[PDB]
């Protein structure tokens, strides 16, 4: 596992520039599916 590259996800996509919704649709695979 790694809470690590899921809080990386979740801290990089809105850093970029995404929303709240899609950071979950595209870091939720990587944190818990």
């Given at each position: 596992?790694?809470?690590?590259?899921?809080?990386?996800?979740?801290?990089?996509?809105?850093?970029n520039?995404?929303?709240f919704?899609?950071?979950?649709?595209?870091?939720?695979?990587?944190?818990?599916?």
């Amino acid at each position: 596992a790694s809470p690590q590259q899921a809080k990386y996800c979740y801290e990089q996509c809105n850093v970029n520039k995404v929303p709240f919704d899609q950071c979950y649709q595209m870091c939720s695979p990587l944190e818990r599916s």
